[PDB]
Amino acid sequence: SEEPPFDIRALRADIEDMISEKLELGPSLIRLAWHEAASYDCFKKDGSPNSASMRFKPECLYAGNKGLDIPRKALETLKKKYPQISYADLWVLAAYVAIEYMGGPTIPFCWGRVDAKDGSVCGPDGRLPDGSKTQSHVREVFRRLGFNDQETVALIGAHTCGETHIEFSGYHGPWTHDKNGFDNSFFTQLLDEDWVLNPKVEQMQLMDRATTKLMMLPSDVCLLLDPSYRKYVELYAKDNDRFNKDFANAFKKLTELGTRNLHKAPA
Numbered sequence: 369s370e371e372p373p374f375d376i377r378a379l380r381a382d383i384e385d386m387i388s389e390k391l392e393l394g395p396s397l398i399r400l401a402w403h404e405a406a407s408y409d410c411f412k413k414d415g416s417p418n419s420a421s422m423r424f425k426p427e428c429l430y431a432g433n434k435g436l437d438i439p440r441k442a443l444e445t446l447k448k449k450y451p452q453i454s455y456a457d458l459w460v461l462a463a464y465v466a467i468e469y470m471g472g473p474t475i476p477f478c479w480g481r482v483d484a485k486d487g488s489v490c491g492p493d494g495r496l497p498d499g500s501k502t503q504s505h506v507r508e509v510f511r512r513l514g515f516n517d518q519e520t521v522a523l524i525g526a527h528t529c530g531e532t533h534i535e536f537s538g539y540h541g542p543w544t545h546d547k548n549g550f551d552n553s554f555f556t557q558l559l560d561e562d563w564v565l566n567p568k569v570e571q572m573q574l575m576d577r578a579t580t581k582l583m584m585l586p587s588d589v590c591l592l593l594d595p596s597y598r599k600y601v602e603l604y605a606k607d608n609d610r611f612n613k614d615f616a617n618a619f620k621k622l623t624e625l626g627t628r629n630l631h632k633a634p635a
């Protein structure tokens with residue numbers, strides 16, 4: 369353990385406090401950190417993941433990043449108050465806090481990420497997964513990130529919390545009945561419901577027959593269609609502890625892609 373130069377105890381507490389005043393914020397912090405890592409290509413070794421390069425054009429304007437200005441701006445306050453933290457570390461830390469606050473795992477945090485200085489390091493568009501595409505696309509994107517199928521499914525389970533917004537993705541609604549709880553219920557809703565066409569959302573999405581108030585994207589239900597992905601959907605649906613543990617491991621790996629010289633924070 370190595371004590372960071374910013375007051376991490378106070379800062380964790382401030383993040384929890386922000387999240388408690390604005391509930392919809394917790395999940396967006398997770399989506400922020402994920403999208404900042406998802407630009408990586410492990411074959412080309414570029415894309416500048418975990419560097420807060422999304423603060424810059426062109427990356428901030430990519431369609432996949434629509435709406436992430438909100439968590440970005442919410443975190444600005446905290447950057448002013450703890451100027452020693454890099455934006456990159458801040459985004460990651462916020463998401464870790466978000467996850468634990470919502471009843472998810474406690475991910476061991478490493479600090480020391482260097483912020484991108486300008487948009488020239490940004491990778492191309494077309495790196496973020498598209499909700500309308502299915503398993504061959506999802507596998508292509510995650511293999512480009514460096515993940516196997518197991519880590520892929522665990523990661524997508526973050527859809528346990530939060531919701532889609534028409535104004536951001538063009539999709540509408542939450543995946544689960546408690547969008548502020550972090551657990552395996554994304555995998556439970558995925559197997560236990562009958563997913564029918566939602567006939568009134570312009571961008572094709574499914575709804576649960578039982579209530580019609582839950583949704584799934586084509587990229588979510590593709591996990592059931594692909595026999596390798598389905599395997600891990602079943603794994604996590606039937607064992608919440610295993611999902612907690614695999615998610616924590618995959619998320620930490622993810623928010624550590626393309627980083628170097630990090631220090632272990634105290635718990």
Ligand code: HEM
Pocket residue numbers: 392395396398399402435497498499500506523524526527529530531532533534536537538539585587619
């Ligand atoms: C197959 C890959 C994925 C696709 C296609 C996808 C797609 C989407 C879409 C379309 C939204 C709605 C955005 C909005 O309207 O605000 C969303 C939200 C979200 N995503 Fe994903 N996602 C993927 C994987 C992931 C992963 C790996 C994570 C994190 C580990 C993640 C975390 C989240 C969270 C927490 C939200 C809710 C955001 C909020 O309430 O503001 N997603 N995702």
Ligand SMILES: [Ca+2]
Pocket residue numbers: 403404405407415416417418419420421422427
């Ligand atoms: Ca990035």
Ligand SMILES: [K+]
Pocket residue numbers: 528529544545546547548549550551553554
């Ligand atoms: K949930």
